[PDB]
Enzyme design. Structure first.
Site, PDB file in Angstrom:
ATOM      1  N   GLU A   7      11.354   0.556   9.673  1.00 34.60           N
ATOM      2  CA  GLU A   7      12.282   1.656   9.396  1.00 34.60           C
ATOM      3  C   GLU A   7      11.549   2.938   9.778  1.00 34.60           C
ATOM      4  O   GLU A   7      10.611   3.355   9.087  1.00 34.60           O
ATOM      5  CB  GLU A   7      12.729   1.667   7.933  1.00 34.60           C
ATOM      6  N   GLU A  37      11.715  15.137  16.630  1.00 32.47           N
ATOM      7  CA  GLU A  37      11.688  14.996  15.183  1.00 32.47           C
ATOM      8  C   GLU A  37      11.620  16.380  14.548  1.00 32.47           C
ATOM      9  O   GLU A  37      11.117  17.339  15.139  1.00 32.47           O
ATOM     10  CB  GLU A  37      10.502  14.132  14.736  1.00 32.47           C
ATOM     11  N   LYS A  53       0.842  -1.181   0.000  1.00 30.94           N
ATOM     12  CA  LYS A  53       0.000   0.000   0.000  1.00 30.94           C
ATOM     13  C   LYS A  53       0.883   1.239   0.000  1.00 30.94           C
ATOM     14  O   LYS A  53       1.604   1.475   0.981  1.00 30.94           O
ATOM     15  CB  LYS A  53      -0.925   0.005   1.220  1.00 30.94           C
ATOM     16  N   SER A  63       6.298   6.466  10.542  1.00 33.68           N
ATOM     17  CA  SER A  63       6.517   7.156  11.806  1.00 33.68           C
ATOM     18  C   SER A  63       6.730   6.163  12.945  1.00 33.68           C
ATOM     19  O   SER A  63       6.255   5.020  12.918  1.00 33.68           O
ATOM     20  CB  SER A  63       5.344   8.083  12.143  1.00 33.68           C
ATOM     21  N   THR A  64       7.460   6.635  13.956  1.00 35.12           N
ATOM     22  CA  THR A  64       7.734   5.849  15.153  1.00 35.12           C
ATOM     23  C   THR A  64       6.447   5.391  15.827  1.00 35.12           C
ATOM     24  O   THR A  64       6.341   4.232  16.245  1.00 35.12           O
ATOM     25  CB  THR A  64       8.597   6.686  16.107  1.00 35.12           C
ATOM     26  N   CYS A 116      16.397   7.348   5.673  1.00 29.40           N
ATOM     27  CA  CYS A 116      17.769   7.350   6.169  1.00 29.40           C
ATOM     28  C   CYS A 116      18.502   8.542   5.591  1.00 29.40           C
ATOM     29  O   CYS A 116      18.664   8.648   4.370  1.00 29.40           O
ATOM     30  CB  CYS A 116      18.484   6.060   5.788  1.00 29.40           C
ATOM     31  N   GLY A 154       4.833   2.639  13.970  1.00 30.41           N
ATOM     32  CA  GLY A 154       5.693   1.492  14.192  1.00 30.41           C
ATOM     33  C   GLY A 154       5.379   0.782  15.491  1.00 30.41           C
ATOM     34  O   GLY A 154       5.286  -0.450  15.529  1.00 30.41           O
TER      35      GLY A 154
HETATM   36  N1  LIG Z   1      -0.311  19.282  10.457  1.00 30.81           N
HETATM   37  C1  LIG Z   1      -0.063  18.229  11.279  1.00 30.81           C
HETATM   38  O1  LIG Z   1       0.133  18.392  12.478  1.00 30.81           O
HETATM   39  C2  LIG Z   1      -0.028  16.810  10.706  1.00 30.81           C
HETATM   40  C3  LIG Z   1       0.167  15.692  11.500  1.00 30.81           C
HETATM   41  N2  LIG Z   1       0.591  14.542  10.866  1.00 30.81           N
HETATM   42  C4  LIG Z   1       0.487  13.328  11.705  1.00 30.81           C
HETATM   43  O2  LIG Z   1       1.649  12.571  11.626  1.00 30.81           O
HETATM   44  C5  LIG Z   1       1.330  11.197  12.037  1.00 30.81           C
HETATM   45  C6  LIG Z   1       1.993  10.214  11.077  1.00 30.81           C
HETATM   46  O3  LIG Z   1       2.744  10.936  10.077  1.00 30.81           O
HETATM   47  P1  LIG Z   1       2.869  10.445   8.538  1.00 30.81           P
HETATM   48  O4  LIG Z   1       3.856  11.306   7.857  1.00 30.81           O
HETATM   49  O5  LIG Z   1       1.519  10.424   7.933  1.00 30.81           O
HETATM   50  O6  LIG Z   1       3.421   8.902   8.621  1.00 30.81           O
HETATM   51  P2  LIG Z   1       2.658   7.565   8.921  1.00 30.81           P
HETATM   52  O7  LIG Z   1       3.489   6.727   9.805  1.00 30.81           O
HETATM   53  O8  LIG Z   1       1.256   7.894   9.412  1.00 30.81           O
HETATM   54  O9  LIG Z   1       2.508   6.892   7.481  1.00 30.81           O
HETATM   55  C7  LIG Z   1       3.365   5.878   6.918  1.00 30.81           C
HETATM   56  C8  LIG Z   1       2.465   4.896   6.204  1.00 30.81           C
HETATM   57  O10 LIG Z   1       1.713   4.189   7.231  1.00 30.81           O
HETATM   58  C9  LIG Z   1       0.377   4.076   6.895  1.00 30.81           C
HETATM   59  N3  LIG Z   1      -0.276   4.039   8.160  1.00 30.81           N
HETATM   60  C10 LIG Z   1      -0.701   5.095   8.922  1.00 30.81           C
HETATM   61  N4  LIG Z   1      -1.256   4.690  10.079  1.00 30.81           N
HETATM   62  C11 LIG Z   1      -1.154   3.304  10.019  1.00 30.81           C
HETATM   63  C12 LIG Z   1      -1.551   2.297  10.934  1.00 30.81           C
HETATM   64  N5  LIG Z   1      -2.149   2.538  12.104  1.00 30.81           N
HETATM   65  N6  LIG Z   1      -1.303   1.015  10.574  1.00 30.81           N
HETATM   66  C13 LIG Z   1      -0.689   0.750   9.359  1.00 30.81           C
HETATM   67  N7  LIG Z   1      -0.287   1.627   8.444  1.00 30.81           N
HETATM   68  C14 LIG Z   1      -0.558   2.886   8.842  1.00 30.81           C
HETATM   69  C15 LIG Z   1       0.121   5.392   6.177  1.00 30.81           C
HETATM   70  O11 LIG Z   1      -1.166   5.361   5.500  1.00 30.81           O
HETATM   71  C16 LIG Z   1       1.388   5.515   5.265  1.00 30.81           C
HETATM   72  O12 LIG Z   1       1.306   4.863   3.982  1.00 30.81           O
HETATM   73  C17 LIG Z   1      -0.179  11.134  12.246  1.00 30.81           C
HETATM   74  O13 LIG Z   1      -0.547  11.295  13.631  1.00 30.81           O
HETATM   75  C18 LIG Z   1      -0.632  12.348  11.402  1.00 30.81           C
HETATM   76  O14 LIG Z   1      -1.946  12.830  11.795  1.00 30.81           O
HETATM   77  C19 LIG Z   1       1.097  14.465   9.547  1.00 30.81           C
HETATM   78  C20 LIG Z   1       0.831  15.578   8.819  1.00 30.81           C
HETATM   79  C21 LIG Z   1       0.053  16.688   9.262  1.00 30.81           C
END
Ligand SMILES: NC(=O)C1=CN([C@@H]2O[C@H](COP(=O)(O)OP(=O)(O)OC[C@H]3O[C@@H](n4cnc5c(N)ncnc54)[C@H](O)[C@@H]3O)[C@@H](O)[C@H]2O)C=CC1
Ligand SMILES: NC(=O)C1=CN([C@@H]2O[C@H](COP(=O)(O)OP(=O)(O)OC[C@H]3O[C@@H](n4cnc5c(N)ncnc54)[C@H](O)[C@@H]3O)[C@@H](O)[C@H]2O)C=CC1
Ligand code: NA
Ligand code: NA
Ligand code: NA
Ligand code: NA
Ligand code: NA
Ligand code: NA
Lengths: 751, 751
Positions: free
Chosen positions: B247, B373, B174, B226-227, B281, B230
Site C-alpha cells: 500500500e 507526491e 515493526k 513510500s513507493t 488512502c 515498495g
Molecule cells: N526532509 C526530507 O527531505 C526527508 C526525506 N524523507 C525521505 O522519505 C523517504 C521515505 O519516506 P518515509 O515517510 O520515511 O516512508 P518509508 O517508506 O521510508 O517508511 C515506511 C516504513 O518502512 C520502513 N522502511 C524504510 N526503508 C525500508 C526498507 N528499505 N525496507 C523495509 N522497510 C523499510 C520504515 O522504517 C517505516 O516503518 C526516505 O528517502 C527518507 O529519507 C522523509 C522525511 C524527511
C-alpha cells in the site's frame, strides 16, 4: 404494412389439433377447446384439456428422466445454450405467434419478450456448468410442477423452465388456457436442442389442470398468477414437504419527486401502460406525484397518452394491442364501472377487443382504487407533499412487488428506495428486467425469487439431508406441592410477564423429581409479543455492528453461567449438558460473526447501470422450537434471526422449558432491546395455528411439527414459512441466514 | 484546558527503556534511540534498534507458535474480540499516547484512530470464527512480516495484525522509527487478551530493521509506506515464493462538479487537510473544481482554512497538530520552496514544529505539483470544464489509490466514479473507512486490499497445494528441409503477423519427424501486441453477456475441430490429446459461464450509506504458458482472463507451440475482437523480462518459470504478478478470476 404471419399460420397448420408434449413426444389430441386470436376473433388452433391420466403421465416421464439429467451439469449447460440459440433463430416465429395468441403489439414481443427469453436461457446455461463446483453442497429437488399466467407467455415459461433445468430438475409446465401456443412451440423445439426425453413436459388446460399439477407427486411447485389461486395452492400443498414459490402480482407504485426528470418520467410511464397487465413485476399503475408538479405532470401525461397508437398488433407501428380475451376486457370495463372516485380520462379506442389507455386522477390516498388490484391499461394517481408521505402511501397496500422512484438528486433517490416495501425498486426507470437480477414479492405478492444466483436456492435442496429429531414426551411425577418459589414466567417486551391464562405446569426430571413450573401461553400472550415486536421496529434499522456487539454479549453471559445451564439440562433430560452449552455458545458467536458480514450482491446487467441485490430483514418471525435440545434449539434459531435484523417470538421446548426460562436473565444482562427477543412456554398445540395465522407476522418457523396446520394457516397473509427439517446438533447457521432475510433488488445508474 | 497525559507518562515511566516484544515477553533494552514528542521537543522514551539476532528470534517465535494458533478458529475469534475490548477499555490511554508520539490532535486520535482500530478487531474476530466453515478450501500462510509508516500508527497496526491473526497467521511487525509507542502498548496488552506466546511479535527500529524482516524466513510480507521502498521490497522478495502486498500512497483527487453541495464539499476538504498525510488512502490533496464555481469555491475554502485551530495537540479544541518530526517539516518547506507554479495561500502558524494549512491554486493540469507526491497539510488545485476532462485530469498520474466525487445529481456522481482509476471512490464524502470495506491501490499505489472478505485472500493460500509441471525440452530432429508450407506465424491485433526478427524454429515430434515451424518473437513483436491491446480498450467496457457469447463461440469452434486438435497434440507429445481437448473445451464453457456472474459485494457499514465492492478488469495482461499442456495451458489462462474484461498477450508453450498456432483460426472464426487475444511463440528466455518489465502492462503471469526475473522486473511500474503454482490438469478457474480482477470500492448514499 403489418408483419406477415404466413410462417406462424404454416406451423399451426402443420401441428393440427394439439395434444400434449409428454415423455419427449406429442400425444394424440384429446378433449379440444379453441385458442382464439383476440384481434381478429378467429380460432388459431384447437388444444387439449389434459386429463388426470395425462398429468400422471407427464409427472411420471419427468420422474423417469430426472436422475440421468441431474448427473451431468456440463451437458445440461449445452442444452440450455441450444434452447437459447433456437429461440434466437426462430425469434420472428415466436414473436408473431405470441402476438397472434395474446394480442400484444408485435414490437413488444420482438424487442422485449423474445430477447429476454433468450437471455434467460443463455444466462442460466452457465449455472448448470458451475453447479457441481460452485454449489457443491446443493442438489436438485427432482420434478417441478409449474403453472403460469397469460400476460407474458413465452417469458413466463423461460422464467420457470431455465433455472429448473439448470439445477438438474425436470418440469411439467402448464401455460394459461388463453395463451398456450408459444409454450407448444417451445415444446416443439426441445427435440432439436437435445432436451432428453421427459425432461420438459408441457400440458395444456384450464385451472382444473393446474390443480392436478399442484397436487401431483412433484417435489416443487412454482406458480405465477392471482393472489387467490396462490392462497389455494399454499393450502393444497400444506404439509406435503414440497418446495413452493409464489409470484402473485400487485401493481406497484411510481414515485415522482418534485425534482425528477419530468419528461423521462412521463415517457417511462407511457411506455409502461401496455406492459403493466396481469401478475407481472412492474411499476406504473399507482402514480404518486409530489403536489408541486402534479398538474404539469398530469397534463403532459394525458398528451403523451394521446400519442399511443392503437390497432392491429401485427403492425410494428402500434403501441396498444388487443386485450387478451373478451373476459379480460369485461373485467376492465367492470372495474371502471365500479369506481366512483377521481376524474377519468380516456383516449379513444377502435371497435372490438380494445381498451384505451386510461388515467384516473385526483384520488385521495385512502381510495380503494389506490389499494385494489388494477386491470387493463389503467393508471390511478394521487399526490404527496413530503418524501415520508410518499413512503407511507406507497407501503399502504397488502401488496409488495415492485416500485419506481424518480428524482435527479443523488441522496433522495437512494434514501427513498430502501424504505419502500418491495422485492424490486427501480431508480429513474421502470420494468427493467435481467436474468441475473432476482425478482419476486413480499406480503401478499407472495414469496420466492426468480433470476440470478439467488433464484437457484428455490430449485435446490442441501446435498446432505438432515432430519428433525423425534418428539419427546414431558416427564411425569407424583404431584406434591412445591414449598419453594420456582414458577417460571414468559419474557415479553423486555420484562417477565405472567401468562394471560394464569396456568402453569409442573416440570419433572427423568425420575419424577419436581424441578419447577412453567407457564402455559395462550393467544393473548402471543398478541402481546407481537405488539412488543412492533414497538421494536428500530432493531431492523440498526447497524450490523450494533447487532454483533449484542450477540457477543449474549455469548459472553451464557459462558459465565455455562455450568449452571449444563446442570439444568441434565436435571431435565438426565443427559450431560456441557456439549449442548458449548455448542449454544458457539452458535451465538457464529451469528455475531455474521451480523455485519452477510453481503448483498452487485449484478452486472446489459441495461443501464447495475442491479444491487440487497439483503434485508424479513421482519417479525414466530418460531416453534423442538423438544430436543432445550437450550441449543432455542439459541440456534434465535441467534441468526436477530443477527440479520429480525425480531422474534420463540415457543421454547415443550418437554423441557426451563433452560429457555433460565435464559431470560441472559437476555436482560446482555441489553437485548425490549421486544427483539420474546419467549413463550407451553403447549405447541395451543400456539402453532395462532403463530402461523397471525396477520402481523412476516414469517413462521415451525420446527416441532404441525407442518400441515402451519403451512395452511400461513396462507392468510401469505407469510413465508419453514417447517424443517431442523437438527439442532447440526450447524444450520448459514442456511438459517437465508430463511431470515429477504432479497430486495435496487437498480441504480452506474458507469 | 488540555487533556491530561498523567496516565500515559505513568505507563512510559513503568516500561522504562524498551526492548522488543518477542515470544510473549519483553527483551532487555538494546541499542537505544529516542522517540520525541514533536509538540514539546521532549524525549518520551528510549526504544531499541533491533539486531539481526532479534529479528531472527521474533520470526522463530512466530514460527513456533503458528500451527497451534491456526488449528482453532473459534479460539482465535475470542482473542481478537478481547483485543478489541482492551482497545476500548484503554481508549483514552491509546489516544493520548498516539498524540504524544505522533503530534496529531487528540480529537482525531480519540474519534477516528482508536475507534476504527477497535472496529477492525471486533469485525475480524468473526472471520476467524467463520474461516473453517465458510472458507474451507483456504489455509493460513504461516508467518507474516509487517512494516508500517508513521501517519496512523495504531490504525496501521490494526489493519495489518487483525486479518493476519484472523486467518491463523502469526506476525512480526515493526512500527515506524518515529512512532513506536502505541505499538509497544499494543504489545503490552497482548498477554491480557489471551494472545498465545509468540503469536504477536513487535520489534522496533529504522528501515534497516524493516529490511531484515522483509528478507527473513517469512511466508508473507505486507508493507505500507513510500513507493520507493515498495519497489525495493518487491525486488528483495523476487523469486522467494512469498506472498506480497504493498500500500504505497498517492494523494488522491477530489472532484467538485458544478452542481455539488458547495458547503459540504468545502467542509469535507477542510476536515481532511490534517488527515491527508503520509501513505494513507485519502482524498483531498489534488483539488479539481469545475470552472463555473471555482472562484466561489476557492474563496470559501480559504476562509474555512482560516477557522482551523493550530496548537497544543492535547487540546481537544485543536484541528492542526504538530508535524510528526522536524525532518517531515523540512520536507514540506522544501516542497513549497521547490514549486514555482500557482498562487500560494497560507494561514499563520505558531512557533515550532507546526506547518499551516496551505492552498496552492491556479495550477494547470500539466503542472508537476498536480502529479508529484504532496507533503504536509497542503492542497493543490486546478480547474476543469467537462466531466470527461475531470476524468482525464484525475487519471493523469502514476498513482491510483482513492478519489472523491461531489455532485448532487444522481447520474453524474455514479457515472463519474467507475471511470476514475482507484481502489476507492467516495461519492459526496471523503476518507470514509470501515473494517468491512476493502482499500488498496492500483498502478504505482501498489497492489492488494485490506479489509473485508476481500482482504482475507492476501492472508491465505489454498488448503490443497498444486504444483507446476516440470519444464519439457523441445524434441530434436535431423534437419531436412520442408517441401511444404508449414511455418506458423504470430497472432497480433486480429491478424497473423510475421515475427519482426524473421526467425523460426523447426518443431519435431517424439521420433524426430518434422511437424512444421514456429516463429521466434522478440521485443518488437511484444510491443506490437501491447499497442493492439491498447486499441482494444473497448473490450474492458463490454457487457458480461457479450463476452459470454464470444467465449461460447470459441468453445463451439474448438469442438468442431476437436479431433484435429487432439491429433496435433499427439503429433507433438506422443500422448493422446483427446482428454486435453475435452478439458480445454470445458474451461472455455466455464469461463463463458462466469463472464456475467462474478458479482461485486455490497457492504453494510456503520457510516452513511453502503460500500459497493465492485469487480473490475485488471486491464492488459501478459501471460507465459507452461511447456506441458500445449492447448490446455493456453486456453485455461486465456479464457478466464478475457471473461473478466481483460486483454491478453500469451506466450504459448515453448516446447509445443503448434496447438496454439492452430488456435488462431478458432479465434478468427469466433469473432474475438482484434487485440483482445494476442499470441506469441518462441523462447521464453527472450520474452519473460520484457513482459514483466513493460510499463504499459497491468499484470504479468509467468507460469513457465523465471519467477525471480519476472517479479524483480515487475517493480518498474508495480504491476501485479502471479508466478504460480499452475497445474493445467487442475481447474484453477475460480482462483484465476481473482488474478484477473481488481476490487474498486464505491461508497454511495443509501437508506
Ligand atoms: N526532509 C526530507 O527531505 C526527508 C526525506 N524523507 C525521505 O522519505 C523517504 C521515505 O519516506 P518515509 O515517510 O520515511 O516512508 P518509508 O517508506 O521510508 O517508511 C515506511 C516504513 O518502512 C520502513 N522502511 C524504510 N526503508 C525500508 C526498507 N528499505 N525496507 C523495509 N522497510 C523499510 C520504515 O522504517 C517505516 O516503518 C526516505 O528517502 C527518507 O529519507 C522523509 C522525511 C524527511
Ligand atoms: N370478467 C371478469 O370478471 C373475469 C374474472 N376473472 C377471474 O380472475 C380470477 C383469476 O384471474 P386470472 O387472470 O385467470 O389468473 P389465475 O390465477 O386464475 O391464472 C394463473 C394460472 O393459474 C392457473 N390456475 C387457475 N386456477 C388454478 C387453481 N385453482 N390451481 C392451479 N392453477 C390454477 C390458470 O389456469 C393459469 O394458467 C378468476 O376468479 C377468474 O374467474 C378473469 C377474467 C375475467
Ligand atoms: Na388466445
Ligand atoms: Na409473503
Ligand atoms: Na450495464
Ligand atoms: Na515520536
Ligand atoms: Na499495481
Ligand atoms: Na450505513
Amino acid at each position: 404494412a403489418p408483419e406477415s404471419a404466413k410462417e406462424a399460420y404454416a406451423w399451426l397448420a402443420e401441428k393440427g389439433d394439439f395434444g400434449h408434449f409428454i415423455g419427449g413426444a406429442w400425444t394424440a389430441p384429446g378433449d379440444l377447446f379453441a385458442t382464439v386470436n383476440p384481434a381478429t376473433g378467429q380460432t388459431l388452433a384447437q388444444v387439449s384439456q389434459a386429463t388426470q391420466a395425462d398429468v400422471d403421465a407427464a409427472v411420471k416421464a419427468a420422474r423417469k428422466a430426472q436422475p440421468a439429467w441431474a448427473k451431468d451439469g456440463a451437458a445440461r449447460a449445452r442444452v440450455l445454450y441450444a434452447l437459447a440459440r433456437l429461440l434466437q433463430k426462430h425469434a420472428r416465429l415466436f414473436a408473431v405467434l405470441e402476438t397472434l395468441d395474446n394480442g400484444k403489439p408485435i414490437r413488444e414481443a420482438r424487442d422485449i419478450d423474445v430477447p429476454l427469453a433468450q437471455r434467460h436461457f443463455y444466462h442460466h446455461a452457465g449455472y448448470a456448468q458451475l453447479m457441481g463446483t460452485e454449489m457443491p453442497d446443493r442438489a436438485p429437488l427432482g420434478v417441478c410442477g409449474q403453472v403460469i399466467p397469460w400476460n407474458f407467455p413465452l417469458l413466463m415459461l423461460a422464467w420457470k423452465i431455465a433455472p429448473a433445468l439448470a439445477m438438474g430438475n425436470t418440469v411439467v409446465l402448464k401455460p394459461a388456457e388463453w395463451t398456450p401456443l408459444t409454450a407448444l412451440l417451445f415444446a416443439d423445439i426441445c427435440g432439436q436442442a437435445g432436451v432428453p426425453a421427459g425432461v420438459v413436459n408441457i400440458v395444456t388446460g384450464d385451472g382444473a389442470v393446474g390443480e392436478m399439477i399442484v397436487t401431483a407427486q412433484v417435489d416443487k411447485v412454482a406458480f405465477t398468477g392471482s393472489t387467490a389461486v396462490g392462497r389455494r395452492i399454499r393450502e393444497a400443498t400444506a404439509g406435503t414437504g414440497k418446495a413452493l414459490s409464489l409470484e402473485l402480482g400487485g401493481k406497484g407504485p411510481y414515485v415522482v419527486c418534485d425534482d425528477a426528470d419530468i419528461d423521462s418520467a412521463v415517457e417511462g410511464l407511457v411506455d409502461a401502460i401496455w406492459f403493466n397487465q396481469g401478475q407481472v413485476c412492474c411499476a406504473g399503475s399507482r402514480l404518486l406525484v409530489q403536489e408541486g408538479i402534479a398538474d404539469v405532470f398530469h397534463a403532459k401525461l394525458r398528451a403523451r397518452m394521446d400519442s399511443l397508437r392503437i390497432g392491429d398488433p401485427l403492425d410494428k407501428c402500434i403501441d396498444i394491442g388487443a386485450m387478451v380475451h373478451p373476459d379480460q376486457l369485461a373485467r376492465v370495463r367492470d372495474m371502471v364501472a365500479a369506481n366512483t372516485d377521481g376524474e377519468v380520462y380516456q383516449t379513444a379506442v377502435p371497435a372490438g377487443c380494445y381498451y384505451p389507455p386510461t388515467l384516473i386522477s385526483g384520488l385521495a390516498p385512502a381510495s380503494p382504487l389506490m389499494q385494489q388490484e388494477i386491470f387493463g391499461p389503467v393508471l390511478v394517481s394521487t399526490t404527496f407533499r413530503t418524501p415520508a408521505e410518499a413512503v407511507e402511501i406507497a407501503n399502504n397496500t397488502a401488496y409488495g412487488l415492485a416500485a419506481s422512484v424518480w428524482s435527479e438528486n443523488v441522496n433522495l433517490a437512494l434514501d427513498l428506495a430502501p424504505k419502500l416495501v418491495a422485492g424490486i425498486v427501480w431508480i429513474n426507470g421502470t420494468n427493467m428486467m435481467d436474468a441475473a437480477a432476482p425478482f419476486g414479492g413480499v406480503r401478499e405478492s407472495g414469496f420466492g425469487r426468480e433470476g440470478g444466483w439467488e433464484g437457484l436456492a428455490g430449485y435446490t435442496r442441501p446435498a446432505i439431508a438432515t432430519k428433525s429429531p423425534a418428539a419427546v414426551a414431558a416427564y411425569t411425577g407424583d404431584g406434591a406441592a412445591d414449598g419453594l418459589d420456582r414458577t417460571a414466567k414468559l419474557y415479553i417486551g423486555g420484562k417477565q410477564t405472567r401468562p394471560d391464562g394464569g396456568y402453569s405446569r409442573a416440570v419433572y426430571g427423568p425420575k419424577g423429581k419436581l424441578l419447577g413450573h412453567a407457564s402455559l401461553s395462550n393467544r393473548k400472550d402471543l398478541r402481546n409479543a407481537v405488539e412488543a415486536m412492533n414497538a421494536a421496529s428500530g432493531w431492523s434499522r440498526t447497524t450490523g455492528h450494533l447487532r454483533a456487539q449484542i450477540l457477543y454479549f449474549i455469548g459472553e453471559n451464557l459462558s459465565a453461567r455455562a455450568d449452571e445451564f449444563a446442570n439444568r439440562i441434565k436435571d431435565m433430560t438426565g443427559k450431560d449438558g456441557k456439549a449442548e452449552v458449548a455448542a449454544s455458545i458457539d452458535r451465538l458467536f457464529s451469528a455475531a460473526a455474521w451480523a455485519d458480514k452477510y453481503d448483498g450482491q452487485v449484478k452486472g446487467v446489459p441495461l443501464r447501470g447495475v442491479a444491487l441485490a440487497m439483503k434485508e430483514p424479513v421482519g417479525k418471525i414466530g418460531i416453534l422450537c423442538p423438544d430436543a435440545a432445550p437450550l441449543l434449539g432455542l439459541v440456534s434459531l434465535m441467534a441468526p434471526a436477530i443477527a440479520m435484523g429480525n425480531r422474534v417470538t420463540l415457543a421454547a421446548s415443550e418437554a423441557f422449558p426451563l433452560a429457555a426460562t433460565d435464559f431470560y436473565q441472559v437476555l436482560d444482562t446482555s441489553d437485548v432491546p425490549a421486544g427483539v427477543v420474546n419467549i413463550l412456554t407451553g403447549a405447541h398445540a395451543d400456539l402453532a395455528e395462532p403463530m402461523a395465522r397471525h396477520l402481523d407476522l412476516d414469517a413462521v418457523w415451525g420446527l416441532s411439527g404441525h407442518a400441515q396446520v402451519i403451512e395452511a394457516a400461513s396462507a392468510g397473509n401469505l407469510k413465508r414459512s419453514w417447517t424443517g427439517p431442523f437438527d439442532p446438533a447440526h450447524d444450520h447457521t448459514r442456511d438459517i441466514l437465508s430463511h431470515a432475510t429477504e432479497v430486495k433488488t435496487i437498480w441504480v445508474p452506474y458507469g
